[PDB]
Design a protein around this ligand. Structure first.
Ligand code: ALF
Ligand SMILES: [Mg+2]
Length: 1031
């Protein structure tokens, strides 16, 4: 998807400002097709190099953005050899998608900023940065910009206009303004106050989100820069530019920006980028090859936001380092920069066409008053607008808001502490969930089962093994998690030497005299002891099994230690050797006093082996089984090695189909992906790797949809590629559930429609939902809550549509003769019946049984529409029949059809219609809520039946006994006759008919019959799955 740039500078004053001022009022059309708007402003045709208002052309792009160039304080090919030194003839830059874009006079075009990797910078000229040169420092600071993540504040004045113009937000305002013309102020205030409260709450939530996002990212530290002279000074982290000599302190913390090592090595603790916390050795970069692509040297480049544990000095005053990536183009900036700026119509057009048809149905009947009635002399303008706006209820968006906030409160009662009610209705339609082995799926700590070899619960064996195991702790427990777990497993308690005494030994304690230091070059940790227990002391040292085995030639060597090691490595186990060497007391005293290491490490003897396991939570397996039972496909994404991820997935027990992995090969312009095994078709599932996933992005000749559909386990996934994977998965109209606890998946969580974070910090800031529990058992609960919310929203929408249609038809029938159903009656029908019913019908939740059928994802199913149409025809037909019956029957006095105003309210025509229509809303409210399949049984939840019974009883009383409420309400007394009995019989027969219709339609018996056999392919996945399943 290519793009271009065009623009022109501001014009002189004159008629241009007049026309710009003119565009103030008619800019309502600027939302769509901005080409006319931009061409109607001060944007003439000029050169491509003297442009000021940069805009994007319509080169296979939609919704072009707009930006303003930033002025420059002062004005005056080798693939960007670094065209930027000094002051050029003209300097212009602008902000776009984070990193700014610089202008190059020689290229005559806007060249996107790229690192030295794109320019193919040779290594011969590198490795020579000994601090800042004589070149001006401000030039680099200005061109690259500050090393701070800029996030707009988005205050109230610049935020209201952005999120105060929605389709159902202008119509509501028009309806509110309409009421002031013809009284009815009581209803307007109720909507106005709730709308204002909702707007204020939304603004406050947006402001809080912006504030917490801005405060989350910030750099405040002082770094040391090695000057080329003979002095060093401290500088802030906000003035870091590439090509600067960085000095790493021996006890440094976080990494303000990316840097490359040139001398020495230092341990790293990458935790915000990779799930595994194993330290990685990063050495210098002595090389003389060609271009440095910064892709094949991951073992020498430090990423931003990485903690350093220990650093080793080298020859010279101190270690040296260089800066190669900083600003918005660094690793940390890229993840953040991909969130701020970056984030069918068939049903919408059908709905708008239906609304237009409904509006034009009544638009001509209203003007027909001149035919069968006397015109009110230009008073129909207000009446016509009222009829137009009554076709839908102004509180339609608010109808589901009560259900959404009730569901949010129910969730907040226990488990997830929701912050704002949103994205709940769409959360029920969940079919895939992403999990990571570390953090949530497995315990963070490392547990040791014990020593397998002897040449089960602890304390069983007797001998020097217990002393060796319990004394190997070089660092005292009290004055990493693995050491704590190891010391806890043995069951002992720890806290000549001050605080180096052992407990739980029947004999005198074995006290360690000195502890050897840990070094990167040497992985040996030896401990020397000496005790008066009339036994020769022993020396214990731990290290890699290979080294001890190789250097244990003089003594006995292990047998059959290769195949076991390979199997353990393939299974994810880590093998560590426990070497030992006896030493008498006298030589040991001198060895400890003189700090001798060569003499004690010359010969050793292994005693046992130790391994670690993830120790996954037991509660995970039932949750996974329940999730899979509902035809939900589970996928695993993690940055750990594929060897551990595959075995963890296999040990989960969810399912064991054929498993194969793609083997990575040497780099090549054309790459082939072969198969593997643990040609005959089977149920094997695809499993990609890290490099292959990133290589497939550039070209996708085939297997693009066929891979993600069967994708099961992904390993070594980069933090940036997770967003791309989420976008690719969502391109097929699919819902992806991103779950994690680290900060390396914030972009994926934001992109994903629904996500769960198990950490109170980091992911909690951006994740829509925050979980206070460290277990994955909440996903089924969230899915059930979303499904229940969607069902309740659908039921509420159906009820609101039915009520609106009934009200519109009742108004239309009465419009034939001069009537308006009064004012108090209308106010009661609106406020009382609607509010008391809608709220009470949306306070139910799912049961403890998980089903298989999932709710429809849209309100386009034919059964519901057919049922609604049948109900509408039935109600209108019964109303017409009742009107005909009451008209043919001889009544007391003819209606006064002289005055065309609501002054003759007392009459027999309005009384028989208002009361008859009142029961319809209550009847329909109790026949639109689903029962057994999704909601709880109706009888169990009975806050609403009592209210409905009371309302029906009071309505029957007021429509039976004269003088009860006929004074204030526009009702007329009726002589005691058999009309009431006939009305009650009609109501009862309609009730039973509607109930029978609902009961028969709920089973959806005709659905299967009508499904034989129109092929349905309204999906991007089922069509390909059908073809795949053929073979
Ligand atoms: F292994 Al993770 F987020 F914990 F990728
Ligand atoms: Mg995680």
């Amino acid at each position: 998807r290519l793009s271009g740039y065009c623009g022109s500078p501001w014009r002189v004053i004159g008629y241009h400002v007049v026309v710009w001022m003119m565009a103030g009022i008619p800019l309502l059309l600027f939302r769509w097709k901005p080409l006319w708007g931009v061409r109607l402003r001060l944007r003439p045709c000029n050169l491509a190099h003297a442009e000021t208002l940069v805009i994007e052309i319509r080169d296979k792009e939609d919704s072009s953005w707009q930006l303003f160039t930033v002025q420059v304080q002062t004005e005056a090919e080798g693939a960007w050899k670094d065209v930027s030194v000094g002051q050029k003839r003209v300097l212009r830059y602008y902000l776009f998608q984070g990193q700014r874009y610089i202008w190059i006079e020689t290229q005559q075009a806007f060249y996107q900023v790229s690192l030295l990797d794109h320019g193919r910078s040779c290594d011969d000229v590198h490795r020579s940065r000994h601090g800042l040169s004589l070149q001006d420092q401000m030039v680099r600071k200005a061109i690259y910009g500050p090393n701070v993540i800029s996030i707009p504040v988005k205050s109230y004045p610049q935020l209201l206009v952005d999120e105060a113009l929605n389709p159902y937000y202008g119509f509501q305002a028009f309806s509110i303004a309409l009421w002031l013309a013809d009284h009815y102020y009581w209803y307007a205030l109720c909507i106005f106050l709730i709308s204002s409260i909702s707007i204020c709450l939304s603004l406050y939530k947006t402001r809080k989100q912006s504030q917490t996002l801005r405060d989350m990212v910030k750099l405040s530290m002082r770094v040391c820069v090695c000057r080329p002279g003979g002095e060093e000074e401290w500088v802030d982290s906000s003035e870091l530019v590439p090509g600067d000599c960085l000095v790493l302190p021996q006890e440094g913390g976080l990494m303000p920006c990316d840097a490359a090592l040139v001398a020495g090595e230092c341990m790293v603790n990458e935790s915000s980028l990779t799930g595994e916390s194993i330290p990685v050795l990063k050495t210098a970069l002595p090389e003389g090859l060609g271009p440095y692509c910064a892709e094949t040297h991951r073992r020498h480049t430090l990423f931003c936001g990485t903690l350093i544990l220990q650093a080793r000095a080298y020859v010279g005053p101190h270690v040296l380092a260089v800066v190669t990536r900083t600003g918005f183009c660094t690793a940390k900036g890229g993840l953040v920069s991909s969130i701020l700026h970056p984030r069918f119509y068939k049903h919408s057009m059908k709905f708008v066409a239906a609304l237009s048809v409904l509006a034009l149905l009544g638009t001509i009947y209203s003007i027909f008053i001149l035919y069968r009635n006397r015109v009110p002399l230009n008073e129909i303008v207000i009446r016509a607008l009222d009829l137009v706006t009554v076709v839908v209820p102004p509180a339609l968006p608010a109808a589901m808001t009560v259900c959404t906030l009730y569901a949010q409160s129910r969730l907040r009662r226990q488990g997830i502490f929701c912050i704002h009610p949103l994205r709940i209705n769409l959360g029920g339609k969940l079919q895939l969930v992403c999990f990571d082995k570390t953090g949530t799926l497995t315990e963070d700590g490392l547990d040791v089962m014990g020593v397998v070899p002897l040449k089960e619960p602890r304390r069983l064996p007797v001998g020097p093994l217990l002393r060796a195991l319990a004394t190997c702790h070089a660092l005292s427990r009290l004055q990493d998690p693995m050491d704590l777990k190891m010391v806890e497993s043995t069951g002992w308690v720890l806290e000549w030497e001050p605080q180096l005494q052992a407990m739980e030994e029947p004999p005198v304690p074995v006290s360690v005299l000195h502890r050897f230091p840990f070094s990167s070059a040497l992985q040996r940790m030896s401990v020397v002891v000496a005790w008066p227990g009339a036994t020769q002391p022993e020396a214990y040292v731990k290290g890699s099994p290979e080294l001890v085995a190789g250097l244990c030639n003089p003594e006995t060597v292990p047998t059959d230690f290769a195949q076991m090691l390979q199997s353990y490595t393939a299974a994810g186990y880590r093998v560590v050797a426990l070497a030992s060497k006896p030493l008498p007391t006298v030589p040991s005293l001198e060895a400890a006093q003189q700090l001798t290491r060569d003499t004690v490490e010359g010969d050793l003897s292994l005693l046992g082996l130790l391994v670690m396991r993830n120790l996954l939570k037991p509660q995970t397996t039932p949750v996974i089984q329940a999730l899979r039972r509902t035809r939900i496909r589970a996928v695993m994404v993690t940055g750990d090695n594929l060897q551990t991820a595959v075995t963890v997935a296999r040990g989960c027990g969810m399912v064991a189909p054929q498993e194969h992995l793609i083997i990575v090969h040497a780099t090549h312009p054309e790459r082939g992906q072969p198969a593997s095994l643990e040609p005959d078709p089977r149920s094997r599932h695809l499993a990609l790797s890290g490099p292959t996933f990133g290589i497939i992005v550039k070209h996708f000749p085939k297997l693009l949809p066929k891979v993600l559909v069967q994708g099961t386990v992904f390993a070594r996934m980069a933090p940036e590629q997770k967003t791309e994977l989420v976008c690719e998965l969502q391109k097929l109209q699919y819902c992806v559930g991103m779950c994690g606890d680290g900060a390396n998946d914030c972009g994926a969580l934001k992109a994903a429609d629904v996500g769960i974070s198990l950490s109170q910090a980091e992911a909690s800031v951006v994740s829509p939902f925050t979980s206070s529990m460290a277990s994955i058992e909440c996903v089924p609960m969230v899915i059930r809550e979303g499904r229940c919310s969607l069902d309740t929203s659908f039921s509420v929408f159906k009820y609101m549509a039915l009520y609106s249609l009934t009200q519109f038809i009742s108004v239309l029938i009465l419009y034939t003769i001069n009537t308006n159903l009064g004012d108090l009656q209308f106010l009661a029908i609106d406020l009382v019946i609607t509010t008391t019913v809608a709220v009470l019908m949306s306070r139910t939740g799912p049961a403890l049984v998980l089903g298989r059928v999932r709710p429809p994802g849209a309100l386009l199913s034919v059964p519901v529409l057919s049922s609604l149409l049948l109900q509408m025809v039935l109600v209108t037909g019964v109303q017409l029949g009742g009107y005909f019956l009451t008209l043919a029957q001889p009544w007391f006095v003819p209606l006064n059809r002289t005055v065309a105003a609501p002054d003759n309210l007392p009459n027999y025509e309005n009384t028989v219609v208002f009361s008859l229509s009142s029961f319809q809303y209550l009847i329909l409210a109790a026949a639109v809520s689903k029962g057994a399949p999704f909601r709880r049984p109706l009888y169990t939840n009975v806050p609403f039946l009592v209210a409905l019974a009371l309302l029906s009883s009071v309505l029957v009383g007021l429509v039976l006994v004269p003088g009860l409420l006929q004074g204030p309400l526009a009702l007329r007394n009726i002589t005691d006759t058999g009309f009431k009995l006939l009305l009650l019989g009609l109501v009862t027969l309609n009730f039973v008919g509607a109930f029978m219709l609902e009961s028969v339609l709920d089973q959806c018996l005709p659905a299967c019959l009508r499904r034989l056999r129109p092929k349905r392919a309204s999906k991007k996945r089922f069509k390909q799955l059908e073809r795949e399943l053929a073979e």
